[PDB]
């Protein structure tokens, strides 16, 4: 039945009305009723009547505490990206470097051309990424799709334990320039994420359907056996870049999409994604949850090689939402199998 929704697991785009836009969790459940989640990624274009902020002109003084220079090594569609942290800098400083002759966008006709250039010059002229900047650019009173307070059940983590995890249940801001990249990964605990491109040049995305996630992992393990041997989930290091021609070569299903300023992207549990920025821009993101996520959370395979990695205690979610399974789960005997095609239960209100 849901098997029959988005049979191609293609990236879907939505144009909600303002009445639809007002309840975040509701619209997420809706797009899942339409099979959007099968793609691992979905675009949502907000009503033109809407804006998260009046103007972005006071932010030249905002500090980027930890700019990252992205060194990339590799060949033939396979790359490993190393982060070189640069000293702190303000936005206008970043912007100046970004639009500088050395680091600015090349001229191009169709997107296929800029894309080809990205994959040809990835390892050259390492850019700087203004990544993981704590904060929001939303105006304090915006109540629709506010990344700072979406009110999903992920709120149960801070609510029950007081724990905050930067970028996960708090917002992150991302200042990009041309050729800055995000490597193939799913979210921490295989959560959802939301990404809003506040302003600037586009951000392009690749995505692999959750139902084909394991095949991407098998490929990645084969191409990086040393890292696979060292960590049960080395893709979570977010250092691994794989070109679309390589995915095609090895029969991994995927889709691509370009995100424009003023547009939202949603990633879904266990949706592998990667991409790059076209030029100077600014993006805001955080994670969020639905009831459907809970099983993904319980089964997420986590990085086994670092003390510093995000691990959310699933106990509270299982007690509150799977009370009949708690004893079974705690006893390690819960063998529930995940069906990536099924929408979250909250969509019962639609379906």
Annotated catalytic sites, by residue? 167, 174, 185, 187, 273, 285
Q: Which DSSP symbol is given to 147? A: T
The smaller minimum CB distance to Ni ion, of residues 186 and 322, is found at: 186
Query: Which residue is associated with the tokens 């959750």?
Result: 210
Interacting span for Zn ion (CB under 5 A) from 5-13, 29-37, 224-232, 311-319: 224-232
Is 237 annotated in a binding site? The answer is yes
Q: How far is the CB of 231 from Zn ion (least distance, A)?
A: 3
Task: Using the Cα atoms of residue 232, residue 236, residue 237 and residue 240 in order, give the sign of their dihedral.
Answer: positive
Which residues, 185 to 204, sit near Zn ion by CB under 5 A? none
Distances (CA, A) of 234 to 70, 77, 176, 231, 253: 18, 18, 24, 5, 21
Q: Longest C-alpha distance within the chain, in Å?
A: 61
Q: Residue 231 interacts with Zn ion (CB under 5 A)?
A: yes
Quick one: what does residue 70 bind among Zn ion, Ni ion, none, with the CB cut-off 5 to 8 Å set by partner type? none
CA atoms in the 13 A half-sphere facing the CB of 133: 24
Work out whether strand 272-277 and strand 172-176 pair parallel, antiparallel, or are unpaired.
unpaired
Helix (H) or strand (E) holding 330: helix 326-330
Q: Is 83 assigned a ligand-binding role in the annotation?
A: no
Q: How far is CA 288 from the centre of its chain?
A: 11
Residue with the two structure tokens 């009173």: 141
Contact of residue 104 among Ni ion, Zn ion, none (CB under 5-8 Å per partner type): none
**Residue 305 binds: one of Ni ion, Zn ion, none (C-beta under 5 to 8 A by kind):** Zn ion
CA-to-CA distance for 38 and 32, rounded, in angstroms? 8
Residue 338 as a binder of Zn ion (CB under 5 A): the answer is no
In the shown chain, the binding pattern of residues 178 to 197 toward Ni ion, with x for contact by CB under 5 A and - for none, equals ---------------x----
Residue 303 marked in a binding site: yes
Please report how close the Cβ of residue 130 comes to Ni ion at its closest, in angstroms.
16
Supply the minimum distance, in Å, between the C-beta of residue 4 and Zn ion: 38
**CA 27, chain centre distance (Å):** 18
Decide whether 22 or 311 has the Cβ nearer to Zn ion: 311
Q: Which residue's structure tokens are 């033109």?
A: 48
* The entry of Ni ion, Zn ion, none that residue 303 binds, CB within 5 to 8 Å by partner kind: Zn ion
Query: In the bound complex, what is the minimum distance in angstroms from residue 213's beta carbon to Zn ion?
Result: 17
Binders in 305-334 for Zn ion, by CB under 5 A: 305
Is residue 228 involved in binding Zn ion (CB under 5 A)?
A: no
Which residue bears the tokens 């069906």?
A: 339
Query: Of these partners, Ni ion, Zn ion, none, which one is at the site of residue 150 (CB under 5 to 8 Å by kind)?
Result: none
Say how far apart CA 179 and CA 120 lie, in whole Å: 11
**Which tokens hold the place of 320?**
């509150």
Footprint of Ni ion (CB under 5 A): 193
Footprint of Zn ion (CB under 5 A): 231, 303, 305
Binding site for Zn(2+): which residues?
231, 237, 303, 305
Binding site for 2-oxoglutarate: which residues?
129, 195, 203, 238
């Amino acid at each position: 039945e849901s098997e029959t929704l988005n049979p191609s697991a293609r990236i879907m785009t939505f144009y909600p009305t303002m009445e639809e836009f007002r309840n975040f969790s509701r619209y997420i459940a809706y797009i899942e009723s339409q099979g959007a989640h099968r793609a691992g990624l979905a675009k949502v274009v907000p009503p033109k009547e809407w804006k998260p902020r009046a103007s972005y002109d006071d932010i030249d003084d905002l500090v980027i505490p930890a700019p990252i220079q992205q060194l990339v090594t590799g060949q033939s569609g396979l790359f490993t990206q190393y982060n070189i942290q640069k000293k702190a800098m303000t936005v206008r400083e970043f912007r100046k470097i970004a639009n500088s002759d050395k680091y600015c966008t090349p001229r191009y006709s169709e997107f296929e051309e800029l894309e080809r250039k990205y994959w040809k010059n990835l390892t050259f002229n390492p850019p700087i990424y203004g990544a993981d900047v704590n904060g929001t650019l939303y105006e304090k009173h915006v109540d629709e799709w506010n990344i700072g307070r979406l009110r999903t059940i992920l709120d149960l983590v801070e609510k029950e334990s007081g724990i905050t995890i930067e970028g996960v249940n708090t917002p992150y801001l991302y200042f990009g320039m041309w050729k800055t990249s995000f490597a193939w990964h799913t979210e921490d605990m295989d959560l959802y994420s939301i990404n809003y491109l506040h302003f600037g040049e586009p951000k392009s995305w690749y995505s692999v359907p959750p139902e084909h996630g394991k095949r991407l992992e098998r490929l990645a393990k084969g191409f990086f056996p040393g890292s696979a041997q060292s960590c049960e989930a080395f893709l979570r290091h977010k250092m691994t870049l794989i070109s679309p021609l390589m995915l095609k070569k090895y029969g991994i299903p995927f889709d691509k999409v370009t995100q424009e300023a003023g547009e939202f992207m949603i990633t879904f549990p266990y949706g592998y994604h990667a991409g790059f920025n076209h030029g100077f821009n600014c993006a805001e993101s955080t994670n969020f949850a639905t009831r459907r996520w809970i099983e993904y959370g319980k089964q997420a395979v986590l990085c086994s090689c670092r003390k510093d990695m995000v691990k959310i205690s699933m106990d509270v979610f299982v007690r509150k939402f799977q009370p009949e399974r708690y004893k079974l789960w705690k006893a390690g005997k819960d063998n529930t199998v995940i069906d990536h095609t099924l929408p979250t239960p909250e969509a019962a209100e639609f379906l």
